[PDB]
Design an enzyme around this catalytic site. Sequence first.
Site, PDB file in Angstrom:
ATOM      1  N   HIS A 116       0.850  -1.224   0.000  1.00 41.59           N
ATOM      2  CA  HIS A 116       0.000   0.000   0.000  1.00 41.59           C
ATOM      3  C   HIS A 116       0.873   1.258   0.000  1.00 41.59           C
ATOM      4  O   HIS A 116       0.731   2.111   0.892  1.00 41.59           O
ATOM      5  CB  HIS A 116      -0.993  -0.060   1.153  1.00 41.59           C
ATOM      6  CG  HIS A 116      -2.083  -1.040   0.904  1.00 41.59           C
ATOM      7  ND1 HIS A 116      -2.190  -2.217   1.608  1.00 41.59           N
ATOM      8  CD2 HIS A 116      -3.103  -1.031   0.020  1.00 41.59           C
ATOM      9  CE1 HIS A 116      -3.248  -2.874   1.189  1.00 41.59           C
ATOM     10  NE2 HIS A 116      -3.823  -2.172   0.228  1.00 41.59           N
ATOM     11  N   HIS A 154       1.993   1.533  -5.687  1.00 42.99           N
ATOM     12  CA  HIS A 154       0.572   1.103  -5.785  1.00 42.99           C
ATOM     13  C   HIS A 154      -0.310   2.280  -6.256  1.00 42.99           C
ATOM     14  O   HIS A 154      -1.095   2.082  -7.196  1.00 42.99           O
ATOM     15  CB  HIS A 154       0.115   0.491  -4.453  1.00 42.99           C
ATOM     16  CG  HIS A 154      -1.349   0.234  -4.398  1.00 42.99           C
ATOM     17  ND1 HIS A 154      -1.972  -0.657  -5.251  1.00 42.99           N
ATOM     18  CD2 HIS A 154      -2.312   0.735  -3.598  1.00 42.99           C
ATOM     19  CE1 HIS A 154      -3.261  -0.695  -4.974  1.00 42.99           C
ATOM     20  NE2 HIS A 154      -3.496   0.156  -3.968  1.00 42.99           N
ATOM     21  N   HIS A 210      -5.544   7.541  -3.230  1.00 42.46           N
ATOM     22  CA  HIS A 210      -6.642   6.690  -2.695  1.00 42.46           C
ATOM     23  C   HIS A 210      -6.182   5.885  -1.480  1.00 42.46           C
ATOM     24  O   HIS A 210      -7.061   5.432  -0.749  1.00 42.46           O
ATOM     25  CB  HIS A 210      -7.227   5.753  -3.754  1.00 42.46           C
ATOM     26  CG  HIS A 210      -6.452   4.494  -3.921  1.00 42.46           C
ATOM     27  ND1 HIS A 210      -5.366   4.420  -4.760  1.00 42.46           N
ATOM     28  CD2 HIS A 210      -6.608   3.269  -3.380  1.00 42.46           C
ATOM     29  CE1 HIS A 210      -4.878   3.198  -4.733  1.00 42.46           C
ATOM     30  NE2 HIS A 210      -5.630   2.467  -3.912  1.00 42.46           N
ATOM     31  N   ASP A 211      -4.874   5.696  -1.282  1.00 43.77           N
ATOM     32  CA  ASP A 211      -4.348   4.951  -0.104  1.00 43.77           C
ATOM     33  C   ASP A 211      -3.427   5.849   0.730  1.00 43.77           C
ATOM     34  O   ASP A 211      -2.583   5.304   1.478  1.00 43.77           O
ATOM     35  CB  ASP A 211      -3.652   3.672  -0.552  1.00 43.77           C
ATOM     36  CG  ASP A 211      -4.569   2.463  -0.600  1.00 43.77           C
ATOM     37  OD1 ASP A 211      -5.578   2.427   0.151  1.00 43.77           O
ATOM     38  OD2 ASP A 211      -4.249   1.550  -1.363  1.00 43.77           O
ATOM     39  N   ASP A 216      -7.918  -0.690  -8.419  1.00 43.16           N
ATOM     40  CA  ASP A 216      -7.318  -1.016  -7.107  1.00 43.16           C
ATOM     41  C   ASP A 216      -6.797  -2.459  -7.101  1.00 43.16           C
ATOM     42  O   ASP A 216      -5.786  -2.693  -6.436  1.00 43.16           O
ATOM     43  CB  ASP A 216      -8.325  -0.785  -5.982  1.00 43.16           C
ATOM     44  CG  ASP A 216      -7.652  -0.655  -4.642  1.00 43.16           C
ATOM     45  OD1 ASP A 216      -6.481  -0.274  -4.621  1.00 43.16           O
ATOM     46  OD2 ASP A 216      -8.300  -0.926  -3.651  1.00 43.16           O
ATOM     47  N   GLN A 261      -5.678 -17.588  -3.175  1.00 38.14           N
ATOM     48  CA  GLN A 261      -5.694 -16.829  -4.445  1.00 38.14           C
ATOM     49  C   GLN A 261      -6.863 -17.320  -5.307  1.00 38.14           C
ATOM     50  O   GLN A 261      -7.652 -16.491  -5.784  1.00 38.14           O
ATOM     51  CB  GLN A 261      -4.321 -16.944  -5.112  1.00 38.14           C
ATOM     52  CG  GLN A 261      -3.289 -16.023  -4.481  1.00 38.14           C
ATOM     53  CD  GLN A 261      -3.765 -14.588  -4.439  1.00 38.14           C
ATOM     54  OE1 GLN A 261      -3.868 -13.921  -5.467  1.00 38.14           O
ATOM     55  NE2 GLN A 261      -4.110 -14.119  -3.247  1.00 38.14           N
TER      56      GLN A 261
END
Length: 315
Positions: free
Chosen positions: A67, A71, A105-106, A216, A268
Amino acid sequence: LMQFTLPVRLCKEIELFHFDIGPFENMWPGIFVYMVHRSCGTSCFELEKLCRFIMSVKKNYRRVPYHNWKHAVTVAHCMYAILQNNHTLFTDLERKGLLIACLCHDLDHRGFSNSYLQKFDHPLAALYSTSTMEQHHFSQTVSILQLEGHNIFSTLSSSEYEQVLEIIRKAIIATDLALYFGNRKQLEEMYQTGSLNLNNQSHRDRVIGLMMTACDLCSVTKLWPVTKLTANDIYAEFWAEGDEMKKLGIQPIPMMDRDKKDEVPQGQLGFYNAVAIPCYTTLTQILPPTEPLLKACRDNLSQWEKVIRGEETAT
Ligand SMILES: COCCn1ncc(NC(=O)c2nc(C3CC3)ccc2Nc2cncnc2)c1C(=O)N(C)C
Ligand SMILES: [Mg+2]
Ligand SMILES: [Zn+2]
């Protein structure tokens, strides 16, 4: 004028959805300005203010495995690819606000989920009871926009500035995956009943929310070697949060337990089937030119299945 230009390989490959922005941190600001000049226009922002804004945003991302600043720019680049292959569908303010939303956004992410902040009794959990981190990311965005020489929207009227901050606020909040399940379901119903209307603002909001989820998660839409290596970074955070859960005396969920590493491929698989494939499927339905995200997501799903069958190894 001074036009931003990339080396030949980056110039070509940045238009591809599966573009990787590379290991040179110092080139990412240039890459972002390039994408803004091409997706918005060279007159959308004053270069000096945009540059100052970019560097302040960079400074307020943390040295965490996933993050992080890389990213933010990666999510922005996926948004660039969606906008450029759908250029007739978005407004001037949406182009202006959405690359900025993705970059921001993060902001100030510490590598911990909303759940951990709730269980820890973090002050942010008292301030923002739902979408805790995402409300904090937006607040951080506003802080930076209010610094001297940082008002990148200075030539917007009051009402336009308010619209774009509202596009940004909703986009950042939409990156709370807890909200995505409901939003995709609504968009699925709306599409299949033929009620979906891009002239309805409450419908634009949901489509942009889904675009933000897709951007994202876009690490599952890279070529396999990028996806596999990026999955190490995400698990580095998950396992650290699991450790912090164990310190609180709470059993972490399996994906956050570093003792359950052998179940990552099945985890996953569970994530592609429950979250990623449905996400890119619905996005392709609404925005058919985003097909390459869904195709690369399917290819990586196939790779995880190859790992589960012991035909591929992930160390
Ligand atoms: C109930 O949750 C457990 C079920 N579960 N298992 C795994 C997983 N998420 C991811 O792997 C993941 N999450 C994100 C963000 C939503 C947090 C982004 C990328 C991810 N993968 C990935 C793969 N390759 C390269 N880069 C990243 C979840 C999940 O649903 N979450 C919400 C985290
Ligand atoms: Mg986030
Ligand atoms: Zn993110």
